[PDB]
Design a protein around this ligand. Structure first.
Ligand SMILES: O=[N+]([O-])c1ccc2c(ccn2[C@H]2C[C@H](O)[C@@H](COP(=O)(O)OP(=O)(O)OP(=O)(O)O)O2)c1
Ligand SMILES: O=[N+]([O-])c1ccc2c(ccn2[C@H]2C[C@H](O)[C@@H](COP(=O)(O)OP(=O)(O)OP(=O)(O)O)O2)c1
Ligand SMILES: [Mg+2]
Ligand SMILES: [Mg+2]
Lengths: 610, 610
């Protein structure tokens, strides 16, 4: 039902005309069309079409419905065509690199984020996953400049984090009108309507519109950017002060002890309205219980622990709370994502082993890829191009961590899983910093490298004051970095995940593996009825009950521990979903404080409840 | 309850501090504060406070609730203070002119529009009534540039006309996304939401989103910008074609025979969807019957008959449909309004007479005033400053035409009213062109004067191919204009009307006069019950029944005739409200065609129904 020869499919996509209007509407960039034609025989023959059968039914259907390019509503592209299109869009004239990427992706060692699959090699190749936007100014002009920026970004793929800390709250004076402002909520309604026409919102809990903000969902997502001081006041059952940004300037522009001093001074001066810390705390947990939101990200852990700290104060994260990157009125941070497929590295050796050397190597390939994406990307707005070109941050993720544990017969909560978790992330961090250091030797370091923690030999685990696990040699890597720099300000931000296309469990959270096991025990409607849980089931061995636990069945304390463990290797943050069976204000509270005290940057992304 | 000395009130307003914030918030401009202080004795003594009693209870309460400046929620200003503030804000250092304006307004010979009363002499002296905005481009960028412009305008006083003819309709192709647009309605929702956060919409009936557009109200107001060709196709029961602007470029950029040729050619080429003219006609009348809208303004009469025709094609009117002024992406036309109080010129001479010589003189005073307003105005956006400074259009209105007829014992539909109507408007047009010509001798003509109909000796009544009534000498005026120019591209746009402050009937449509008459006949609850109509009432003389008819009782054909009569003296348009007792599709249709055939620019503003 589809043309086989790749160059021919490229021809059709390139020559496409919209019949209804008579308008030529090429679906491939000139740049990539030319490259294919000059490389025709090399490219057509490199492709192995049997690999289209490496997809699950769910996997292929996802690709078919969305990703495979279509002509007149008919799918033109085979999966292998998409992969090669993507490889070429990323690598351009470097055919050797394109073929390597083609092979590794086609054999499913790694994949690239959705926007890359959609747009790579097309005329508006917008390959990036999200954008972190700063509210430009607290004025109608700045608000409408920001709104326009967001409309333009919305024309492309990708989500938007937007921090609003600087907008004056309800009842704040307006010199112009001698009137008072109606605050954040009606401004948010403007942004929501613009999103519909063509979104994660970030706010610090001292903002005087906070109680309304967190109730937004009772589609924009509220996320709290939480200073440590708030959590201390809550713990101690103390007071908390709400300020309009205009009566307490600069709070979002400092963190840690500098913030606490400035904040405490503003409290003393009677610049705001004082309440009981736990009053707001209670409202937050109430909103989370009912809506899944607000998200929780710890502003102080994010800033103290960022290799971008030399740029200034980081004011937000993104929709999925994995991205921690600097943003300002003239700079919109960009998310460039790809994920390694963790099970691809499992090897027989009767026992199964994990090949860390090969994971290291694939992680280095993806790192180089994401750097090419930065350079070949189509930027929807100038703020985003400026940001990416200056600090060149990337975000490597993973998928199939759960799958990996299961294939290797490791219960998620086991000592063996705990160790593998740590090893996998040390490897990927080391690999990506090694590849990035190599690129710095070739192309130079990123523009802002000098004065960064990494230039001083401080890597991520150093900022957690921990020693690395030591599977790789960090001292040599660190010597090289201090000498040559790295090409990327940041490297890792394991994300939500593309994971359904590769047929693996969405990462990084906890069934063909279970099924194969029931087959081998001959047992072969419970799971439907009991929702995929095998505990409390009479005929199944303890070993399967231990291996096959459901995320509702796994201790959130273990999830939080494992996240704390891998976080020493993570430049950015990562999405922590939390699952509560029988949600209680007390249990939620302790989940938050536990993650907080572990030093987590992202305390919670979504709260999923029974 | 209020300080008497004007300079002292000015002092208080100037020195005002917002207590809650500790912020100085002066309510008078530096410029005007200084002028008052240097003129202190002259200004304080010029004021006559007995004149505060010249207001009706309804009149004064309107002023008090809104216009009189307040300090801490307390009214600081007496009406006389407001009038002098306004006089000074308009005239600046010209004290002689300020005193003349002070006297005439305080004796109620004329007034200025609401924004002028509000803001004259304050720090952001935005004295203009509305703004005619062009949609910048048919793109997300142009749409959001326009949205920002409108938000900024919305911070000040004044309404917005916005013409959207250039935005592509539902199902139109978008090269960028290979998708299709959702057209005007969701774009309009964006503008509506922006209006709420911080509106008349203009569309030609060939636009393919037209059926949804006219149903908008079934607060933004749809108004039709109607070519003659539409009305002919309707009359003849012919076809009508709907185009997306993108499939039929340029239709809004020509009018008259040029339009008909281009339109007919696009029809022949099958660029659109053909329907029956009366299908759309029917939907329009249905919308008007139920909502009062869409408004009807005739695009060809507006353009063929405009002294601004040398600028390009006029694409819209304003909210009240009196303003006909050129607008483009870089130029936002501005409405500068003031109204003459028509009854002030009634004089005893047992009979009452009308003093046309004094009306002439007051009309010249207001003309000079409105020119000062142009120069001293605070412009919210640069497009508006550019427009006003280049073409310097003004709009003189009237109020109390109905009052005038009644004081003089003239039934509205009488031959005597018909003549007075014509004389009053000839006088005001002549006066304003005489004053404007005087200013051109002093300051030069407006920048675009050369090549205009007026530079060729073509005045408004010439473009109706009529001879003026001849109460004033037009030949001398016309000779002077061709020689010296005029300072203003346009002069008259009688508006909605400020008419409740002066205690006169809202103009120009059809009771102390009735009451005084019942008193004199000794008759002294009917009117409540019967809604102010004296017909069908046994004890009242025919002469009163004839004089005191209610607008529901007056022939709309007479209203339309009288409007056609005064329209030869009107540079711009004027608001024609229509009243239907027992509304029928047939009667509405004939009302439209009758006005259309009379050559009216504004066919209908609001339709008011039983
Ligand atoms: O003028 N308005 O009609 C107006 C002005 C400001 C308004 C709103 C509705 C909301 N705001 C918010 C938007 C900003 O958060 C803040 C200040 O906006 P601004 O600076 O543009 O307002 P100005 O009237 O120009 O006052 P300022 O000059 O002190 O800031 O007020 C309306
Ligand atoms: O890209 N989008 O997601 C997008 C693009 C345009 C959109 C909408 C929703 C409405 N429109 C309207 C707004 C304009 O009336 C018209 C074209 O807008 P544009 O030029 O900005 O769109 P492009 O995708 O840049 O296509 P173009 O380059 O042919 O105009 O389409 C969404
Ligand atoms: Mg400001
Ligand atoms: Mg375009």
């Amino acid at each position: 039902q589809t043309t086989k020869q790749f160059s021919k499919v490229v021809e059709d996509l390139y020559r496409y005309v919209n019949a209804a209007t008579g308008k030529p509407a090429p679906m491939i960039s000139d740049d990539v069309y030319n490259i294919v034609m000059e490389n025709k025989d090399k490219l057509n023959s490199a492709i192995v079409y049997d690999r289209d059968f490496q997809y699950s039914y769910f996997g292929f259907k996802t690709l078919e419905r969305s990703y495979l390019l279509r002509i007149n509503g008919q799918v033109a592209e085979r999966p292998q065509h998409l992969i090669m299109r993507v490889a070429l869009g990323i690598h351009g004239r470097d055919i050797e690199a394109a073929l390597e990427t083609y092979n590794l992706m086609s054999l499913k060692y790694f994949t690239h984020a959705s926007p890359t699959l959609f747009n790579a090699g097309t005329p508006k190749p917008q390959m990036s996953s999200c954008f972190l936007v700063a509210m430009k100014e607290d004025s109608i002009e700045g608000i409408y400049d920001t709104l326009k920026e967001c409309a333009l970004i919305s024309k492309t793929a990708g989500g938007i984090g937007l921090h609003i800390h600087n907008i004056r709250s309800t009842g704040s004076y307006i010199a112009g009108t001698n009137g008072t402002s109606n605050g954040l909520i009606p401004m948010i309604r403007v942004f929501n309507n613009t999103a519909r026409y063509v979104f994660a919102l970030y706010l610090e809990p001292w903002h005087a519109d906070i109680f309304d903000f967190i109730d937004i969902r009772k589609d924009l997502f509220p996320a709290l950017w939480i200073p440590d001081l708030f959590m201390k006041r809550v713990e101690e059952n103390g007071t908390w002060t709400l300020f309009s940004p205009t009566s307490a300037p600069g709070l979002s522009d400092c963190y840690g002890d500098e913030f606490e001093a400035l904040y405490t001074r503003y409290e003393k001066e009677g610049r705001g309205k004082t309440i009981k810390a736990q009053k707001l705390w209670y409202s937050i947990l109430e909103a989370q219980t009912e809506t899944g939101t607000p998200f929780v990200v710890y502003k102080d852990a994010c800033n103290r622990k960022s290799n971008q700290k030399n740029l200034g104060v980081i004011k937000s994260s993104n929709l999925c709370c994995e991205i921690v990157e600097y943003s300002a009125p003239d700079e919109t941070a960009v998310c460039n994502l790809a994920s390694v497929a963790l099970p691809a590295f499992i090897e027989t050796s009767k026992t199964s082993t994990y090949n860390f050397k090969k994971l290291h190597e694939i992680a280095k390939v993806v790192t180089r890829n994401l750097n090419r994406v930065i350079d070949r990307n189509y930027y929807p707005v100038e703020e985003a191009r400026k940001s990416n070109m200056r600090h060149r941050p990337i975000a490597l993720g993973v998928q199939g961590l759960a799958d990996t544990f299961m294939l290797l017969r490791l219960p998620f909560d086991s000592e063996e899983a705990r160790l593998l978790n740590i090893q996998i992330f040390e490897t990927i961090y080391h690999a990506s910093m090694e590849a990035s250091c190599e690129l710095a030797q070739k192309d130079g370091p990123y523009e802002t490298f000098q004065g960064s923690p990494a230039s001083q030999g401080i890597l991520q685990f150093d900022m957690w004051d921990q020693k690395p696990y030591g599977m790789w040699d960090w001292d040599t890597l660190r010597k090289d970095i201090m000498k040559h720099g790295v090409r990327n300000s940041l490297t890792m931000a394991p994300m939500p995940t593309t994971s359904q296309i590769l047929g693996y469990n969405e990462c990084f959270e906890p069934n063909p593996y279970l099924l194969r096991d029931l087959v081998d025990l001959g047992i072969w409607q419970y799971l439907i009825t009991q929702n995929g849980s095998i505990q409390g089931l009479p005929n199944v061995p303890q070993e399967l009950k231990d291996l096959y636990k459901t995320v509702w069945e796994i201790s959130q304390k273990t999830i939080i521990n494992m996240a704390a463990d891998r976080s020493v290797y993570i430049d950015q943050s990562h999405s922590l979903n939390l699952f509560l069976r029988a949600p209680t204000m007390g249990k939620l509270t302790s989940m938050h404080f536990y993650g907080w005290k572990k030093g987590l940057k992202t305390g919670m992304y979504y709260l999923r409840t029974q």
